[PDB]
Amino acid sequence: VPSNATFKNKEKPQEVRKANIIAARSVADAIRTSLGPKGMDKMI
Amino acid sequence: KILVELAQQQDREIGDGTTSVVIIASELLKRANELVKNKIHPTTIITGFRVALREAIRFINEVLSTSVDTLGKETLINIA
């Protein structure tokens, strides 16, 4: 069953998409504390 | 900079009390530092200060004294 069909090459985009999701979720974590009536203000 | 602008503010409205407004505002935050360790959310802390303030302003209006006092003025001299 293996050794046939095709083999995945240039796997860097698989890592680039992971690096983009992790970096985007890190920004969403700081704003998450401001959600709802119990949220807090962010001083910048 | 909040208390810096608050001290400059107190001169605009009343003109006096720049010393008392900074100490009170700094103490409200000092004692609230132990209240957040209780996990109490600030909205509960803010509501506790606001509900107590609404009753405080009404209590001050009940304990005030009229400017009549005795026959003579005996007020403006003591105000200064």
The Cα–Cα gap between B12 and A9 comes to 71
Best residue in B1, B36, B43 for a mutation probing chain A (most A CBs within 10 Å): B43
In chain A, whose CA is at the least distance from the CA of B41? A38
Please report residues of A whose CB lies closer than 8 A to that of B43. 37-38
Could you give phi then psi for residue B49, rounded to 5 degrees?
-80, -35
Cβ atoms B6, B21 nearer than 8 A: yes
| Experimental method of this PDB entry | cryo-EM
Cα–Cα distances in Å, from B73 out to A10, A22, B67, B69, B78? 94, 75, 8, 8, 10
Tokens matching residue B33? 């530092």
